[PDB]
Design a protein around this nucleic acid. Structure first.
Ligand SMILES: [Mg+2]
Ligand SMILES: [Mg+2]
Ligand SMILES: [Mg+2]
Ligand SMILES: [Mg+2]
Ligand SMILES: [Mg+2]
Ligand SMILES: [Mg+2]
Ligand SMILES: [Mg+2]
Ligand SMILES: [Mg+2]
Ligand SMILES: [Mg+2]
Ligand SMILES: [Mg+2]
Ligand SMILES: [Mg+2]
Ligand SMILES: [Mg+2]
Ligand SMILES: [Mg+2]
Ligand SMILES: [Mg+2]
Ligand SMILES: [Zn+2]
Lengths: 129, 125, 55, 81, 222, 25, 97, 215
RNA sequence: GAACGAAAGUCGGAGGUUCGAAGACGAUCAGAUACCGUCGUAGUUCCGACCAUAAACGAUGCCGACCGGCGAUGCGGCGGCGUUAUUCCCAUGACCCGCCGGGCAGCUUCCGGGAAACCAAAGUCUUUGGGUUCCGGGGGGAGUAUGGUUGCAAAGCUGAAAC
RNA sequence: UUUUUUUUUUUUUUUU
């Protein structure tokens, strides 16, 4: 039924970007989703956001810039050992000028660019550009 | 079979539209007026043109035509456009319509001048 | 109005028949084209005058 | 887009639409560069200066233009409080 | 030798030479109507090839009516290309018409780098896609001096579009050029439409050519 | 010939061949 | 292809509707798929009303009507000139005047 | 703003015309203009935001310099009366009657125009010029009703345009605002013409009946 | 692995109106053993058991989320000194107005798609990954042969090759 | 109310 709620969040983000609306409602909340949007915010692709704290499970409302072509989730959360990123680079990123990958390292939810410097690797959550 | 050809009706409307003035309601006169104001290569074409010209004259003398109007009909339609009396752009300068627009003019900053009163049941359509 | 030209051409393939027909333009005076207009193409004169008020 | 030489590489910079921050294409002929004029203060006379609002094609086709022009004029303050 | 015969007010701007380059027209996406406007903006855009001329048949009451369908791809090698499809009952007529329709449908091409900024770009800015019918043409950036690895028809089209290096991936009836060339054309037309994180700067909105040269427009109407 | 009656003729042939097998087991 | 969105009939929620016989060729047809009409008739010829109006005993207060739920199938109704064909955008129509 | 704000003469003329009522159906993008349901199943448009769209439409019309580029259409015979006088009232190019599809697209015909702004009366009656806008890159100011769709509409003025009186009052007041923003007459002075020209004369018979009674 | 599963069919018991395979004639046709008409068998009915198939069709697996509007209609729930029936409050009754939930649907649209017909899903797909079962790989041979298994039988399930 | 059949292969495409 309800599984991998990161996908449920990011397909709503995708439909709202393709439609052209301003702000999205997402009924589940995860620390995964919050740190994912933190990476997207720090790299500037979204705007400011706000978490309605339900006692049960909150709801995230995100102001949208309008730059987001495509965000999404790789489904089974594959492992990625280092010196195996370049497969995912050529397979997922639209170019060698932009695009980002969200790894899950032991030292936090990191970025494709911070991961190669921190020299960790780990599991893939998703991608956005 | 008087279904008359496109070129005949075309030349006839051009003839009446240029020279409404010379043409009268008499067929044999209008026939010879057509040879004065036009160049018609044949006598059958003269007769066809003059016949439909007289049938158009019995419409234009009757009323205005959707095809083309003469200068007199132009001036009369311009008169009917710009006729201005001083009557009813404004009524008596209180008009009563609605309690909902009374609420509206309570909202918007105005003087709440005078009465507005209907109350209705709920049989809309 | 229509000047018919029908000629033969002998080649190694055989024969080629050519037909050329040219509609002459209506010029009212001169040797260029014919002097009778088309019975469909009817010319009129442009409007006459303007001023006509009483005195 | 700049190279390592710092040269402005690209031929033209497309109009990012002021409604929803999306590129007006080279053939997106539904797009319009709306212009609205400036007004003076209490004198109320015309100013020769004007403000420019761009509306792109799919926004115009859907109908976010009617909301969008007032919401773009309202943040600019030219319509109301 | 014959005169340009202006109409439609953009051409009167062209004859007064008040619009500098074709980039000013692509800034506002004004509808181009006459063909020799781009001849005045580009005197070196004669570079073209007829892609394919194929017959189509209409089964009419006596026999099959034949008429030929001509494909012409023109291009300046700086990044401007046009594609024209024209069907007519004569070869020379259809070729002239397809040339004029390509002159009308010329569009610019964005050209980016493979991943190193060094200079004078050589490839598409990203993996773009184009679709026409059931044909998907996917353009992927390529390293420097690779060449264009593709079918001969879009190799010609990207050779005209100023691309030196590209990877292509087709899917569908690639046998039909009538959809395949239009798919490649839509792919290279979407390149300025696709956003990029170095083109986020807010627009400047320079003036319209109409409001910039209203006085010429008033004196040419009057 | 319909697929209906094609199945019917193959079905009748199958019953005939089954009778032949049961006649010589 | 689909020639119609509704597949001709009007069954959508149901799984099976009763059949009803047609009048002409007596074929059973599901009762929404059938061409249904309703003949309200004066039981006399309307030209022959006046003959009975002459020699009628009462003061023309008896006016009997004959009401029949008339029920066609499509394979013979088209032959019997009711449900005449239309165009692509003309199939989207409803009740005739 | 504070000087272009509404006065009591304006709302007196609005309530005298009857623009406050509307139709019975809403477009979903027409929610923000209209105010309240009524007892007779009638939706009342406000006047506060009604003046605002008229203000912005006036600013957009004064924005184009050469007023001949202002092209004004009405198809129906309500606004066919108003458009012809509104065009000569400022500078505009009138086109009423049959719209002649292909007005803006093909150029073989001498009847060809290249406008930079369009004002229409009814979108559902002008389904064709709004469609022709999208090829030739021109905006749209539309006198939208309560039940009118908003495709290819940039600035929508909420009103009722069934009755001829509200149509004529809007065209009068729009010209009245555009000419003041040009600077013909100042704000603190009435406009020198009366909206019946802009309203609409029907079968004269009753016109010359009024003349014959007023002999 | 398991329960239901239309019509027809099979095995007992009861009866048998109408219809009616088979069969019989009469006509039509060159020929009819076919359509048309007259008669009429099994079955159509019910009670017990079996068979498990269909254009079993929305030719659209199931769950979940997002993405336009509009008027309906069915069922609950809520709001509305509008109207109307009791006797006289009072309630549920009957319309009218509107909202909420989910159900069967429909009109419109450049939401986006697809080869198109068309679809608010057949969309959110070369920018391709929510979870999961069953499946197809040019047409024929063929759902045939041949094995196994179920069935009283009709047959069902699984199922190939030469060419 | 009828009303059935009627060899077999012959048919290729341009420059501006
Ligand atoms: Mg193939
Ligand atoms: Mg068919
Ligand atoms: Mg069924
Ligand atoms: Mg049964
Ligand atoms: Mg038996
Ligand atoms: Mg026994
Ligand atoms: Mg027994
Ligand atoms: Mg019987
Ligand atoms: Mg099956
Ligand atoms: Mg299933
Ligand atoms: Mg199933
Ligand atoms: Mg209820
Ligand atoms: Mg109850
Ligand atoms: Mg034979
Ligand atoms: Zn029947």
């Amino acid at each position: 039924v309800r599984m991998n709620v990161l996908a449920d969040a990011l397909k709503s983000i995708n439909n709202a970007e393709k439609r052209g609306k301003r702000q999205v409602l997402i009924r589940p909340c995860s620390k995964v989703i919050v740190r994912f949007l933190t990476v997207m915010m720090k790299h500037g692709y979204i705007g400011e956001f706000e978490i309605i704290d339900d006692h049960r499970a909150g709801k995230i409302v995100v102001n949208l810039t309008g730059r987001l072509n495509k965000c999404g989730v790789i489904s089974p959360r594959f492992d990625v050992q280092l010196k195996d990123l370049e497969k995912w680079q050529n397979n997922l990123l639209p170019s060698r000028q932009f695009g980002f990958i969200v790894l899950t390292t032991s030292a936090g939810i990191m970025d494709h660019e911070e991961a190669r410097r921190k020299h960790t690797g780990g599991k893939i959550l998703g991608f956005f550009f | 079979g008087r279904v008359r050809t496109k070129t005949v009706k075309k030349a006839a409307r051009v003839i009446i539209e240029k020279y409404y003035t010379r043409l009268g309601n008499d067929f044999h006169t209008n026939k010879r007026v057509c040879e004065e104001i036009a160049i018609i290569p044949s006598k059958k074409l003269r007769n066809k043109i003059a016949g439909y010209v007289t049938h158009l004259m019995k419409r234009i003398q009757r009323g205005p035509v959707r095809g083309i109007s003469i200068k007199l009909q132009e001036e009369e339609r311009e008169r009917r456009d710009n006729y201005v009396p001083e009557v009813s752009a404004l009524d008596q300068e209180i008009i009563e319509v609605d309690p909902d627009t009374k609420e509206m003019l309570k909202l918007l900053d105005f003087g709440s001048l005078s009465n507005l009163q209907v109350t209705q049941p709920t049989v809309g359509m | 109005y229509v000047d018919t030209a029908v000629r033969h051409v002998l080649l190694r393939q055989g024969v080629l028949g050519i037909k050329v027909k040219i509609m002459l333009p209506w010029d009212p005076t001169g040797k260029i084209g014919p002097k009778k207009p088309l019975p469909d193409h009817v010319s009129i004169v442009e409007p006459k005058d303007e001023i006509l008020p009483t005195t | 887009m700049q190279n390592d030489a710092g040269e402005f590489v690209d031929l033209y910079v497309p109009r990012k639409c002021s409604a929803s921050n999306r590129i007006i294409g080279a053939k997106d002929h539904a797009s319009i560069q709306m212009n609205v004029a400036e007004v003076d203060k209490v004198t109320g006379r015309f100013n020769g200066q004007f403000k420019t609002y761009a509306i792109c094609g799919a926004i115009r086709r859907m109908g976010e233009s009617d909301d969008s022009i007032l919401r773009l004029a309202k943040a600019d303050g030219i319509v109301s409080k | 030798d014959k005169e340009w015969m202006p109409v439609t007010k953009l051409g009167r701007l062209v004859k007064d030479m008040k619009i500098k380059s074709l980039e000013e027209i692509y800034l506002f996406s004004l509808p181009i109507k006459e063909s020799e406007i781009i001849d005045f903006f580009l005197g070196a855009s004669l570079k073209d090839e007829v892609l394919k001329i194929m017959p189509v048949q209409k089964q009419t009451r006596a026999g099959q009516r034949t008429r030929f369908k001509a494909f012409v791809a023109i291009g300046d090698y700086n990044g401007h290309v046009g594609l024209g499809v024209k069907c007519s009952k004569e070869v020379a007529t259809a070729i002239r018409g397809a040339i004029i329709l390509a002159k009308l449908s010329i569009v610019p091409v964005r050209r980016g780098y493979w991943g190193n900024k060094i200079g004078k770009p050589h490839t598409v800015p990203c993996k773009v896609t184009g679709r026409c019918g059931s044909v998907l043409v996917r353009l992927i950036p390529a390293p420097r001096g690779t060449g264009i690895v593709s079918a001969p028809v879009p190799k010609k089209l990207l050779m005209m579009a100023g691309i030196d290096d590209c990877y292509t991936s087709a899917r569908g009836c690639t046998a039909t050029l009538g959809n395949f060339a239009k798919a490649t054309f839509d792919a290279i037309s979407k390149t300025y439409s696709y956003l990029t994180p170095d083109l986020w700067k807010e627009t400047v909105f320079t003036k319209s050519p109409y409001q910039e040269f209203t006085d010429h427009l008033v004196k040419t109407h009057t | 010939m319909r697929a209906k009656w094609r199945k019917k003729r193959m079905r009748r042939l199958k019953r005939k061949r089954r009778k032949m097998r049961q006649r010589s087991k | 292809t689909k020639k119609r969105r509704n597949n001709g009939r009007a069954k959508k929620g149901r799984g099976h509707v009763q059949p009803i016989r047609c009048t002409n060729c007596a074929r059973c047809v599901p009762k929404d798929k059938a061409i249904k009409k309703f003949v309200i008739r004066n039981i006399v010829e309307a030209a022959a009303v006046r003959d009975i109006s002459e020699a009628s005993v009462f003061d023309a207060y008896v006016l009997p009507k004959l009401y029949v739920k008339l029920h066609y199938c499509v394979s013979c109704a088209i032959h019997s000139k009711v449900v005449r064909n239309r165009s692509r955008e003309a199939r989207k129509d409803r009740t005739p005047p | 703003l504070d000087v272009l704000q509404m006065k009591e003469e304006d709302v007196l003329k609005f309530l005298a015309a009857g623009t406050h009522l509307g139709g019975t159906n809403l477009d979903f993008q027409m929610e923000q203009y209209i105010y309240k349901r009524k007892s007779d199943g009638i939706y009342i448009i406000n006047l506060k935001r009604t003046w605002e769209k008229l203000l912005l439409a006036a600013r957009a019309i004064v924005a184009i310099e050469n007023p001949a580029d202002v092209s004004v259409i009405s198809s129906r015979n309500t606004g066919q009366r108003a458009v012809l006088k509104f065009a000569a009232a400022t500078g505009a190019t009138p086109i009423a009657g049959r719209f002649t599809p292909g007005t803006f697209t093909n150029q073989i015909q001498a009847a060809f125009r290249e406008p930079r702004l369009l004002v229409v009366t009814d979108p559902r009656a002008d389904h064709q010029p709004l469609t022709e806008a999208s090829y030739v890159n021109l905006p749209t100011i539309a006198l939208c009703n309560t039940d009118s769709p908003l495709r290819y509409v940039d600035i929508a003025i909420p009103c009722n345009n069934k009755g001829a009186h509200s149509v004529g009052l809007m065209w009068w007041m729009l010209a009245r605002e555009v000419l003041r923003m040009r600077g013909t007459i100042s704000r603190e002075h009435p406009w020198e013409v009366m909206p019946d020209l802009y309203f609409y004369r029907d079968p004269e018979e009753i016109e010359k009946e009024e003349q014959a009674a007023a002999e």
